[PDB]
Design a protein around this ligand. Structure first.
Ligand code: KGW
Length: 260
């Protein structure tokens, strides 16, 4: 694989957001005798700035090492100014908006499907000793009505997301697979709530107080008990009492099959 892509193969479409380094666009990758392929394009305004270009392109390098159906893929890079990273596009956009609009048209089976797919991605990351640290519905994208994906790891960063974070992450800056399991538990809660944020109206400071007192997000309406049980397990104060993503995958499979 040569990841460098000729600039003329890319047509820049609309801005669909932004990150630390600049704007994110949707567009198209064109190639001889092929259908145009829809893509996301990260831009770096004032790249080179040589140190800036380095950390920008490191975002591509992070994505490059991963190969999973439920994690967005790197297509390629343009390493001349202005520097761009070319990623797979998920055409239906962000999960939260998707869940809010399609609420009365989504069944419970689909919502569990999304948590299952994601857990397979996270079982994949854990087996590569990779720690995401920003698992949250805000960072999941919708590829098809029956397909969600973790988005770019670079664009996922920043909020300290106190409301999603494991206690040992907040208190002592420890970030492991176990703290990832905490955040996933929150992410499934968001999914079952159809994109409502955790701890609405609660100040960040109040949030750590509440979790130490043993308070947890409530069971969503129409969440099956076994699923909420699995969730609360993700929120064991003791990091080693939480299931691994391997276990989460296995249990969600059977819960999903049950609901179908
Ligand atoms: C973790 N977040 C990211 O990776 C990300 C954040 C903001 C913008 C794009 C991101 N990355 C990304 N990748 C692959 N596909 C997509 N698709 C996508 C995302 C947001 C939108 N929006 C369109 C309307 O405004 C709100 C967001 C549209 C998209 O495809 C049309 N996005």
């Amino acid at each position: 694989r040569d990841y460098e892509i000729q600039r003329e193969r890319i047509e820049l479409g609309r801005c669909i957001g932004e990150g630390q380094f600049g704007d994110v666009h949707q567009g198209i990758y064109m190639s001889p005798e092929n259908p145009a392929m829809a893509v996301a394009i990260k831009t770096c305004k004032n790249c080179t700035s040589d140190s800036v270009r380095e950390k920008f392109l490191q975002e591509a390098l992070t994505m490059r090492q991963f190969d999973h159906p439920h994690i967005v893929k790197l297509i390629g890079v343009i390493t001349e100014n202005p520097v761009w990273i070319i990623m797979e596009l998920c055409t239906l956009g962000e999960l939260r908006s998707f869940l809010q609009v399609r609420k009365f048209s989504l069944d419970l089976a689909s919502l569990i499907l999304y948590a299952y797919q994601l857990s397979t991605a996270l079982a994949y990351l854990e087996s590569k000793r990779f720690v995401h640290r920003d698992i949250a519905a805000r960072n999941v994208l919708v590829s098809a009505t029956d397909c969600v994906k973790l988005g770019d790891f670079g664009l996922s960063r920043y909020m300290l997301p106190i409301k999603w974070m494991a206690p040992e992450s907040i208190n002592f800056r420890r970030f492991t697979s176990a703290s990832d399991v905490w955040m996933f538990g929150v992410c499934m809660w968001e999914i079952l709530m159809h994109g409502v944020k955790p701890f609405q109206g609660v100040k960040n400071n109040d949030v750590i107080g509440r979790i130490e007192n043993g308070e947890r997000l409530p069971m969503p309406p129409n969440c099956p008990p076994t699923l909420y049980s699995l969730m609360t397990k993700c929120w064991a104060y003791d990091p080693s009492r939480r299931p691994r993503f391997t276990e989460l995958k296995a249990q969600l499979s059977t819960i999903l099959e049950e609901e179908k």
